[PDB]
Design a protein around this ligand. Sequence first.
Ligand SMILES: [K+]
Ligand SMILES: [K+]
Ligand SMILES: [K+]
Ligand SMILES: [K+]
Ligand SMILES: [K+]
Ligand SMILES: [K+]
Ligand SMILES: [K+]
Ligand SMILES: [K+]
Ligand SMILES: [K+]
Ligand SMILES: [K+]
Ligand SMILES: [K+]
Ligand SMILES: [K+]
Lengths: 181, 72
Amino acid sequence: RHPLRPDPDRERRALERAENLRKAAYEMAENQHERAYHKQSQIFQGRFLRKDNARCLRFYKSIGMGYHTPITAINGTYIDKKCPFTGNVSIRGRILRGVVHSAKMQRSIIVRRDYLHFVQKYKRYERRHKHVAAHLSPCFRVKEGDIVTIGECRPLSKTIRFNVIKVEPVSEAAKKRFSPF
Amino acid sequence: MSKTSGLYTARKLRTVRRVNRWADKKYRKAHLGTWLKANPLEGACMARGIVTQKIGISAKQPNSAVRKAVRV
Ligand SMILES: [K+]
Ligand SMILES: [K+]
Ligand SMILES: [K+]
Ligand SMILES: [K+]
Ligand SMILES: [K+]
Ligand SMILES: [K+]
Ligand SMILES: [K+]
Ligand SMILES: [K+]
Ligand SMILES: [K+]
Ligand SMILES: [K+]
Ligand SMILES: [K+]
Ligand SMILES: [K+]
């Protein structure tokens, strides 16, 4: 890391995101409808009592492969052990793209992938599709029709082996087409 | 063109052939499975049995004879 930190003079003020995260943590403590207190495993919970600010209050990482961390994950207040940026999982294996078929589950979506199958006797093709279940971190929000890029992780449920890592929005009320990519 | 064309119609071309294959009497006899059930020999070259009677059988219209046979 050859270069070192150019000089803005509003940095320490702009770290008011510390009180932001702190009061979000203290709001989670008051929602007595919950049964478990949710917290990241990478973070002490004694760093919140301190005032010198010297220690970070939220954990995040980079996933590699030229995919950059969204700022909504860096400055969010949610808890997700299955989020690839702020949870306890990793991305490795195949990386694919598809379209959102359904977003009706809890932090889970269905993805529709399209492809062609050649039949040699008839010298022609047929159009085919498959459905893939994927995990949706709160740092993204999607609707049906949007393009997504998903990447492989370890097994996460009976049907899920992938995680949403990029979103390309698609306007509502547009003609739905084959769109293989 | 009385048949579908087009670069993405392989599924239709296969469905049509699968459906119309059964219209042929040879294919239907050899592939349906009812003839195998009804066949006295059960799909074999030959079979052994015991004779229960001796008989004579008339021939058909333009011929005249008594053919010799056995109930088995
Ligand atoms: K989290
Ligand atoms: K394809
Ligand atoms: K194929
Ligand atoms: K097709
Ligand atoms: K599960
Ligand atoms: K499951
Ligand atoms: K189509
Ligand atoms: K014709
Ligand atoms: K024809
Ligand atoms: K036709
Ligand atoms: K075409
Ligand atoms: K035909």
